[PDB]
Amino acid sequence: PKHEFSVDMTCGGCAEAVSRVLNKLGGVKYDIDLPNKKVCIESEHSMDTLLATLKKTGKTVSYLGLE
Amino acid sequence: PKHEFSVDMTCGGCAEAVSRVLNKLGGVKYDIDLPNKKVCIESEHSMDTLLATLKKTGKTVSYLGLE
Ligand SMILES: [Cu+2]
């Protein structure tokens, strides 16, 4: 499944921190779009696990949906 | 005790993120100096706990010692 999240990243540092928490979770393939404040994640991890992982950053996160 | 950490924050968004994770931990009095990449924390929480809480952000964190 391909999950789509809004994450309120406002600098390259914010983007890199997202990548680091996702790397720590593992079992993910992702792309981070800074100008559109979007993270897409291909994973077998649950929506809730991915959400909780992103929210660890301390950034505002919401779920946009799924393919 | 009064602990000091370096946290590699590059924008105000990064400072907010640090604020949010520390608020969620609770039992802390902190100040964040964004241009100097420094976070001072007065807490009864162990250094270990504060370090782990800061590293949750996915930002690079190091320990600048007791005041
Ligand atoms: Cu930032």
From Swiss-Prot, chains A, B:
Residues annotated as domain HMA: 1-62
Consequence the record notes for mutating V21A: Has no overall effect on Cu(+)-bridged heterodimer formation with ATP7A
This protein's GO CC annotations: cytosol
UniProt superkingdom: Eukaryota
A GO molecular-function annotation: cuprous ion binding
PTM annotation (N6-acetyllysine): residues: K59
Any one Gene Ontology BP term: copper ion export
Phosphoserine PTM sites in chain numbering: S46
CDD domains assigned to the protein according to its UniProt record, in alphabetical order: HMA
Tissue: Ubiquitous.
Binding positions for Cu cation per the UniProt entry: C11, C14
Keywords of this entry: Acetylation, Chaperone, Copper, Copper transport, Ion transport, Metal-binding, Phosphoprotein, Transport
Family to which this protein belongs: Belongs to the ATX1 family.
Function: Binds and deliver cytosolic copper to the copper ATPase proteins. May be important in cellular antioxidant defense.
Domain free text: The heavy-metal-associated domain (HMA) coordinates a Cu(+) ion via the cysteine residues within the CXXC motif. The transfer of Cu(+) ion from ATOX1 to ATP7A involves the formation of a three-coordinate Cu(+)-bridged heterodimer where the metal is shared between the two metal binding sites of ATOX1 and ATP7A. The Cu(+) ion appears to switch between two coordination modes, forming two links with one protein and one with the other. Cisplatin, a chemotherapeutic drug, can bind the CXXC motif and hinder the release of Cu(+) ion.
Complex and partners: Homodimer. Interacts with ATP7B. Interacts with ATP7A. Interacts (via dimer form) with SLC31A1 (via C-terminal domain); this interaction improves ATOX1 stability and controls intracellular Cu(I) levels.
Protein name per Swiss-Prot or TrEMBL: Copper transport protein ATOX1
Organism: Homo sapiens (Human)
